[PDB]
Motif scaffolding. Structure first.
Motif, PDB file in Angstrom:
ATOM      1  N   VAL A 107       0.877  -1.181   0.000  1.00  0.00           N
ATOM      2  CA  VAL A 107       0.000   0.000   0.000  1.00  0.00           C
ATOM      3  C   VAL A 107       0.908   1.223   0.000  1.00  0.00           C
ATOM      4  CG1 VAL A 107      -1.630   1.387   1.405  1.00  0.00           C
ATOM      5  CG2 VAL A 107      -1.883  -1.137   1.231  1.00  0.00           C
ATOM      6  N   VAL A 108       0.702   2.126  -0.964  1.00  0.00           N
ATOM      7  CA  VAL A 108       1.526   3.315  -1.091  1.00  0.00           C
ATOM      8  C   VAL A 108       0.646   4.502  -0.702  1.00  0.00           C
ATOM      9  CG1 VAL A 108       2.773   4.810  -2.680  1.00  0.00           C
ATOM     10  CG2 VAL A 108       2.911   2.318  -2.959  1.00  0.00           C
ATOM     11  N   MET A 109       1.064   5.240   0.326  1.00  0.00           N
ATOM     12  CA  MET A 109       0.311   6.395   0.823  1.00  0.00           C
ATOM     13  C   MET A 109       1.139   7.639   0.590  1.00  0.00           C
ATOM     14  SD  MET A 109      -1.082   7.018   4.660  1.00  0.00           S
ATOM     15  CE  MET A 109      -1.884   8.538   5.228  1.00  0.00           C
ATOM     16  N   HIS A 173       3.587  -1.156   3.934  1.00  0.00           N
ATOM     17  CA  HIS A 173       2.969   0.167   3.840  1.00  0.00           C
ATOM     18  C   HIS A 173       4.081   1.158   3.586  1.00  0.00           C
ATOM     19  CE1 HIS A 173       0.550   3.645   5.633  1.00  0.00           C
ATOM     20  NE2 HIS A 173      -0.295   3.089   4.781  1.00  0.00           N
ATOM     21  N   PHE A 174       4.033   1.836   2.443  1.00  0.00           N
ATOM     22  CA  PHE A 174       5.068   2.796   2.088  1.00  0.00           C
ATOM     23  C   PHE A 174       4.461   4.168   2.155  1.00  0.00           C
ATOM     24  CE2 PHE A 174       8.312  -0.072   0.608  1.00  0.00           C
ATOM     25  CZ  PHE A 174       7.594  -1.201   0.272  1.00  0.00           C
ATOM     26  N   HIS A 175       4.940   4.966   3.105  1.00  0.00           N
ATOM     27  CA  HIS A 175       4.292   6.228   3.416  1.00  0.00           C
ATOM     28  C   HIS A 175       5.245   7.360   3.116  1.00  0.00           C
ATOM     29  CE1 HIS A 175       1.842   8.685   6.634  1.00  0.00           C
ATOM     30  NE2 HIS A 175       1.840   9.247   5.437  1.00  0.00           N
ATOM     31  N   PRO A 210      -2.476  -6.138  -7.558  1.00  0.00           N
ATOM     32  CA  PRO A 210      -1.993  -4.780  -7.841  1.00  0.00           C
ATOM     33  C   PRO A 210      -1.701  -4.034  -6.544  1.00  0.00           C
ATOM     34  CG  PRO A 210      -4.355  -5.033  -8.379  1.00  0.00           C
ATOM     35  CD  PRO A 210      -3.780  -6.409  -8.180  1.00  0.00           C
ATOM     36  N   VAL A 211      -0.672  -3.200  -6.578  1.00  0.00           N
ATOM     37  CA  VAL A 211      -0.370  -2.332  -5.457  1.00  0.00           C
ATOM     38  C   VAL A 211      -1.508  -1.337  -5.287  1.00  0.00           C
ATOM     39  CG1 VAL A 211       0.801  -0.632  -6.869  1.00  0.00           C
ATOM     40  CG2 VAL A 211       1.359  -0.834  -4.436  1.00  0.00           C
ATOM     41  N   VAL A 212      -1.792  -0.987  -4.034  1.00  0.00           N
ATOM     42  CA  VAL A 212      -2.818   0.021  -3.743  1.00  0.00           C
ATOM     43  C   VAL A 212      -2.135   1.360  -3.493  1.00  0.00           C
ATOM     44  CG1 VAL A 212      -4.680   0.755  -2.202  1.00  0.00           C
ATOM     45  CG2 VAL A 212      -4.489  -1.662  -2.891  1.00  0.00           C
TER      46      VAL A 212
END
Length: 299
Positions: A107-109, A173-175, A210-212
């Protein structure tokens, strides 16, 4: 290379605003009937940002399968992304249901929970290991396992458990925490450093769902991230930093979710990022180390 030729021509003409408007005018328009149903009004963060019916992600749910999220399926590049709005206090369960059902690894934020003094996203993940979250509506459990806080971004390892089957998965989680309140981060370097961290994690790979990717609306920052990744992937596949037409790629993406790239600054930044990232793609492996330096991730 050639996009860099156009880049300088547009910069010389000071015509980014006009270029961007051309994109708006040519971009696809498809129906968003499900998004606009009355029963869904409280599932949308912004009334002017909705997923098209044809590409919306459906929750595997009885009663209501709606979430504000679109599958962006890039045929030639062979990469897919799910772009979504920042979850709302009532849609955090839906959000994690989607991650589970779509088999996403990452998950990319790209936003902070609070920006410009208002709430842009719900606190949808646990901030402390010892305080896990349970989403009763979707019967999922979410635990913070570890976090690596860097200067411009934070990586978290989360464990998502389907409480129904007791099956568990590791989600990364990539923030990206330093995208400025107003004007694009004129360091293509820290953005690229971050994109390459996501790539390195395996989250973007074909063997996972798929990445979110999300920001607040799931179109601006999110659009920039996906557009840069896809352009670089195409250049990699062809090994030809000349055949790749960024405006054309952006228009293709806009077939799947409206409004990707929200203004001329973000468009110009997208060019910059791709141009700079191209150095790595074409054989100059030492640039990644240079970005890491420029992107002082230690402070």
């Amino acid at each position: 290379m050639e996009m860099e030729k156009e880049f300088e021509q547009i910069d010389k003409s000071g015509s980014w605003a006009a270029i961007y408007q051309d994109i708006r005018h040519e971009a696809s328009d498809f129906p968003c009937r499900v998004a606009k149903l009355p029963k869904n009004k409280n599932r949308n963060r912004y009334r002017d940002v909705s997923p098209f019916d044809h590409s919306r992600i459906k929750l595997h749910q009885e009663d209501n399968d709606y979430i504000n999220a679109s599958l962006i399926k890039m045929e030639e590049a062979q990469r897919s992304y799910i772009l979504t709005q920042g979850p709302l206090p009532n849609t955090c369960g839906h959000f994690w249901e989607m991650v589970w059902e779509q088999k996403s690894r990452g998950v990319v934020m790209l936003n902070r929970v609070m920006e410009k003094g208002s709430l842009k996203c719900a606190q949808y993940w646990p901030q402390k290991e010892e305080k896990e979250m349970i989403f009763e509506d979707t019967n999922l459990k979410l635990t913070l396992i570890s976090e690596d806080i860097k200067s411009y971004y934070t990586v978290r390892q989360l464990e998502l458990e389907n409480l129904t089957t007791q099956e568990t998965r590791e989600i990364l989680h990539f923030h990206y925490t330093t995208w400025p309140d107003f004007g694009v981060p004129e360091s293509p370097a820290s953005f690229l450093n971050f994109l390459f961290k996501v790539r390195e994690s395996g989250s973007l790979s074909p063997e996972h769902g798929p990445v979110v990717v999300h920001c607040s609306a799931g179109i601006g920052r999110s659009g920039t991230f996906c557009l840069a990744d896809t352009c670089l992937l195409l250049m990699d596949k062809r090994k030809d930093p000349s055949s790749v037409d960024i405006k054309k790629v952006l228009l293709e993406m806009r077939k799947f979710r409206m409004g990707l790239i929200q203004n001329a600054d973000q468009l110009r930044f997208s060019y910059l990022a791709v141009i700079e990232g191209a150095k790595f793609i074409m054989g100059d492996s030492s640039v990644q180390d240079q970005w890491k330096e420029l992107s002082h991730e230690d402070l």
